[PDB]
């Protein structure tokens, strides 16, 4: 009846394995190191915790931000980290130094998120008023700042394959232009809602996308609603897919409806259960990311906890 309804993919369900309650406040960002040894988890206490990726034990802490830091990234050729938030402090967390050496600047207001390029030595930041500074390596300046937003930039990303510079603003105006030209050749004057959930697929191109209301898929060349998803009215705040093609988007309203990559409808339609300290309706999924091995997904919600949900061996997951 429904699209891809009689063709269900028998993926494993999630099963809670461990919870790491050590942060003081709502989590901001959660990412894993490349060696499967470090896990950077942000919180509103202005202290990024480098915990264990698989063990979950607190390895170290790192302060320097005066307020909550809602942006964290790690480089490929650079063995250092990069922070971004309302304090305008970039903690260049090296594995041997573990101090602040980046000193990212260029934003005229508070920063919400940041991203680094995997191939080129370019970056992107989501300032508050109108700024978007491309933090150049060993320059700490926006030589080519792709600033096409009129408000606090929600999400920004830079790669070296498809849209080298894809970003969105909250002023009902986005800049889906090429990072080489700099000028807004194609103004994405759409997505008036809070669109902050975009992840990668697992095959090639024509992957999925997200929105707070009536989410659907996207496309690499010029964009296109290839796979019409269901009515995902949950306000998605982040999206992180695994290496095997599995995609899951964290919800800001607590109802993190997990959907498949082919159908776009919530397979489980699960929600973030509140901890005993949290309130009834106070929680919201801040981040959810699969590990490098896709063995256990780490979900950091507003309950100040990082839940490590592993896969279960089940086959009775076929829907008509």
């Amino acid at each position: 009846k429904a699209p891809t309804m009689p063709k269900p993919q028998w993926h494993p369900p999630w099963k809670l394995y461990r919870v790491i309650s050590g942060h003081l406040g709502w989590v901001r960002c959660i990412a894993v190191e490349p060696g499967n040894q470090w896990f950077v988890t942000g919180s509103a206490d202005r202290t990024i915790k480098i915990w264990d990726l698989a063990s979950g034990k607190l390895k170290l802490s790192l302060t320097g931000h005066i307020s909550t830091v809602r942006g964290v990234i790690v480089s490929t050729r650079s063995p250092y980290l990069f922070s971004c938030g309302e304090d305008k402090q970039v903690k260049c967390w090296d594995l041997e130094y573990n101090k602040v050496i980046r000193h990212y600047h260029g934003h005229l207001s508070a920063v919400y998120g940041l991203d680094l390029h995997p191939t080129i030595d370019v970056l992107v930041t989501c300032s508050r008023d109108s700024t978007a500074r491309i933090w150049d390596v060993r320059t700490k300046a926006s030589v080519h700042t792709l600033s096409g937003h009129t408000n606090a930039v929600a999400t920004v990303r830079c790669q070296a394959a498809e849209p080298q510079i894809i970003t969105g603003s909250h002023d009902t105006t986005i800049r889906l232009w090429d990072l080489v030209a700099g000028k807004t050749r194609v103004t994405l004057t759409n997505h008036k809602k809070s669109v902050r959930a975009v992840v990668l697929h697992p095959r090639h191109y024509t992957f999925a996308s997200g929105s707070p209301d009536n989410i659907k898929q996207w496309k690499f060349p010029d964009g296109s609603f290839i796979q019409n998803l269901s009515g995902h009215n949950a306000i998605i705040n982040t999206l992180t897919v695994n290496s095997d093609g599995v995609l899951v988007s964290g919800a800001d309203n607590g109802t993190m409806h997990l959907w498949d990559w082919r159908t776009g409808y919530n397979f489980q339609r699960v929600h973030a259960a509140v901890q005993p300290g949290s309130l009834d309706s106070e929680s919201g999924i801040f981040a959810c990311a699969f590990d490098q091995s896709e063995s256990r997904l780490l979900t950091a919600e507003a309950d100040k906890t990082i839940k490590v949900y592993r896969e279960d061996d089940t086959a009775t997951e076929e829907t008509h």
Binding site: I120, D136, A141, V143, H144
Partner: peptide, 25 residues
């Protein structure tokens, strides 16, 4: 990979020119 490498080289040349202009300004 070839078109991505050419676009990365063009963006690197544009960023180097912008950084030289910011250093000379």
């Amino acid at each position: 990979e070839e078109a991505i490498k050419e676009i990365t080289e063009k963006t690197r040349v544009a960023l180097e020119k912008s950084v030289s202009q910011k250093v000379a300004a």
